[PDB]
Design a protein around this ligand. Structure first.
Ligand SMILES: CC(C)(C)[C@@H](N)C(=O)NS(=O)(=O)OC[C@H]1O[C@@H](n2cnc3c(N)ncnc32)[C@H](O)[C@@H]1O
Ligand SMILES: CC(C)(C)[C@@H](N)C(=O)NS(=O)(=O)OC[C@H]1O[C@@H](n2cnc3c(N)ncnc32)[C@H](O)[C@@H]1O
Lengths: 279, 280
């Protein structure tokens, strides 16, 4: 017996078997299941993913909300669910840690070497946790499409690697980064920035968009333009600024690439990245 | 999509081909059964094939693939294999290339839990990572309703159960009892590597295990000592391990599994048996 599903309403399931049963039933009725994985505390950046999933004809949208142990964090369950309702999302999946990890951490996904780079420097087990939980959600929900923000570009690439390497039958959709009015990438960490820090923080996006336009003059011009912009900001400790190919390999001599930055403003770590076309 | 001819052996090499056919077949209400093998098929493999075939409305997919991951030498007889499959009424053989399975080498992989560091994994600490990685790929390509494994490779079976549980895979794992020669020797391809003396000495593994299983009314120590005594009486059998575990291969007077690995010349043989402590 499939759990109750009320079309056009927000249906909340916490039991993996329940969301799995409902998704399967819905797929059989000619719905295309879209999965939007989140950690709750939803803002406009997350809702852009929701909106992209909604515009697929015949879509039913499943938004998961779950905080992974292996990859201090504020939460607001009631408000997250109210945002989802307002967006017309029909399924929220909100499991417990014990439901997701009933045997603890036993089998896990080992990512390839990209997982040790960039964000994997300070947090070398982060992406193992990410790919493990994403794989699990992919198997529970069996979505036709899965949505990730370009904000976490390295995460997006690694999920593309997961999907290809494990022969997963799902399309990965990357969704452009939602920004504040001055270009700052939207993140829950932004609220922690004091006025001085919030003003200096614009340098990340400014550096990157400057680089993207300096790029007609080549790879070194792009890097130098970004570095100059970061160098003009006080209290911005750059962890890395790197230009890579779009799959995060070495930048080829020309063609398409990605410029990624990470920086600390006091105790708040910020990231950003942008498409670059070299030459 | 590619062609599927019902009631005949259909051989696909492209993962995309077998995935499309499997998906199509599952839409038609047929239940997809998967039997992973490395080929060189013998009656032990055919027990899993037959188990799969008896599932009402099943279409049987047998994969034949030798994984360069789980090694760290294997007999290949692919014409025979397909002939046997045809004889069993199997409708699908999946025979992918190494390039098709590993186009990016070893990139994303499965990291098994600590059980994989033990028993068979002690000497071969990356073996089960190879197994779980290839089986996960096969499960994703084929998407079967049920996947069949022999109790012959009991630790592998247990580890597949963990994989399926831990990744929330939508597949039933079916263990199939060990097929034995007339004297009790567990059927294995590695047996062929035994000369007539070694083959005669090889009966000791199953004799020791079955002796243990009957001794076990008298407790775990009696069961283990009986097995060891038989192994000790056996000419030119060198024991790697002989271990009594719980049925999920945790420790230990309940019910359990006794496992043995032994060498006869260069040939490493494995066997295991269900054990009940204090139960007639
Ligand atoms: C995947 C999971 C395991 C659940 C976890 N590691 C995670 O990332 N949780 S999350 O709550 O922090 O992000 C949810 C999704 O929302 C995207 N996102 C966030 N800010 C965004 C923005 N400004 N513009 C565009 N997209 C944005 C992220 O890129 C991610 O794909
Ligand atoms: C899983 C894979 C990655 C393909 C690989 N590690 C593998 O095991 N290849 S294999 O060709 O050696 O065996 C295929 C299956 O056949 C079973 N089996 C063998 N002898 C058996 C016997 N005597 N009685 C019952 N069952 C028997 C094995 O237990 C296994 O489940």
């Amino acid at each position: 017996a499939i759990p109750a599903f009320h079309p056009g309403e927000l249906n909340v399931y916490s039991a993996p078997g329940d969301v799995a049963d409902v998704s399967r039933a819905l797929r059989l009725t000619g719905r295309r299941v879209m999965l939007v994985p989140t950690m709750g505390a939803l803002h406009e950046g997350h809702l852009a993913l929701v909106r992209a999933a909604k515009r697929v004809p015949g879509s039913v949208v499943v938004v998961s909300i779950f905080v992974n142990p292996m990859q201090a964090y504020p939460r607001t369950p009631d408000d997250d669910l109210a945002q989802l309702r307002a967006e017309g999302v029909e399924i929220a999946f909100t499991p417990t840690t014990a439901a997701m990890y009933p045997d603890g951490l036993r089998t896990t996904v080992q990512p390839g070497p990209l997982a040790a780079e960039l964000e994997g420097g300070p947090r070398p087990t982060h992406f193992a946790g990410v790919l493990t939980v994403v794989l699990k959600l992919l198997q529970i929900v069996r979505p036709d499409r899965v949505f990730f923000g370009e904000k976490d570009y390295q995460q997006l690439v690694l999920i593309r690697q997961l999907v290809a390497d494990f022969n997963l039958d799902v399309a990965v959709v990357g969704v452009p980064t939602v920004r504040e009015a001055d270009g700052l990438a939207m993140s829950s960490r932004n609220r922690y920035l004091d006025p001085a820090q919030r003003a200096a923080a614009v340098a990340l996006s400014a550096a990157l968009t400057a680089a993207a336009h300096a790029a007609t003059a080549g790879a070194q011009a792009a890097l130098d333009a970004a570095r100059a912009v970061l160098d003009a900001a006080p209290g911005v400790a750059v962890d890395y600024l790197e230009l890579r190919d779009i799959g995060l390999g070495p930048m080829p001599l020309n063609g398409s690439g990605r410029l990624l930055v990470a920086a600390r403003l006091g105790t708040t770590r910020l990231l950003d990245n942008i498409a670059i076309e070299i030459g």
